[PDB]
């Protein structure tokens, strides 16, 4: 029973549609899962992944992501700021370095060196709720 994609939560249905555009055409599972989760990272109304993500207590949006292919190649970034698509930066850690996990400033330095563009990922909505939480 192949190809088949599974993802977490309700926003996973529409992420799966995206992954399936690759899989139904005989594409690689690696490309399909990257494309699938990037849809949710791209969406500002998806508040727990990428661009609409609620910040840490100091109002900083910091993202974590990792990817693993069919032959134990792995890539990972954690507490990285300003890059909308951490899964692609993790794929680049996997493909373009001798390392497997980069965190913080060092993960952003590498993303920028790979041509990823620096972005503000704190939506107006997320700054607003953050400030409401600071009051509470």
């Amino acid at each position: 029973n192949k190809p088949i994609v599974l993802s977490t939560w309700n926003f996973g249905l529409h992420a799966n549609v995206e992954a399936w555009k690759v899989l139904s055409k005989g594409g690689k599972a690696l490309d399909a899962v990257e494309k699938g989760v990037r849809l949710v990272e791209d969406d500002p109304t998806e508040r727990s992944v990428g661009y609409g993500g609620r910040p840490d207590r100091d109002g900083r949006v910091t993202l974590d992501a990792c990817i693993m292919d069919e032959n134990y190649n792995i890539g990972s970034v954690a507490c990285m700021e300003h890059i909308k698509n951490p899964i692609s930066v993790a794929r680049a850690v996997m493909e373009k370095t001798p390392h497997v996990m980069l965190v913080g400033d060092g993960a952003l330095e590498f993303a920028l060196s790979q041509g990823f563009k620096k972005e503000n990922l704190l939506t107006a909505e997320s700054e607003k709720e953050w400030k409401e939480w600071l009051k509470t």
């Binding site: 996973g12 005989g26 399909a32 993202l63």
Partner: protein, 139 residues
Amino acid sequence: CIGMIALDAQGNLSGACTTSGMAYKMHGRVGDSPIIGAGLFVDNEIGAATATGHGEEVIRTVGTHLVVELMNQGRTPQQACKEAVERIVKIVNRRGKNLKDIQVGFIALNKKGEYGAYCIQDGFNFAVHDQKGNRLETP
């Protein structure tokens, strides 16, 4: 957090997991999503799994590596996910914690394209898309 795992037409597995983490977490806090063996683990000879829930609890139990070794030991994706959750429930209780305060779930896939899922608490769903189409199921 969204985790996604897939088996392609060549029969190869891969997975991805990405999050903005716990809202209003301490600065520098990292959860299970970028950790291999906690948020995501893929072995093309056995299967793959991604986790959902309290980041802390999935790291503490190396959740997804446990699900895949349980499929390696011969469990179905469903059985591996349930047994992995049952082991974590025993650990939540050994730590004198209340299960209502902990949530951890796994979805899993093996090389035949069989899949499964299970959670500590009711209320999580996952999406499955094969040749029967795309559907939302409840573990």
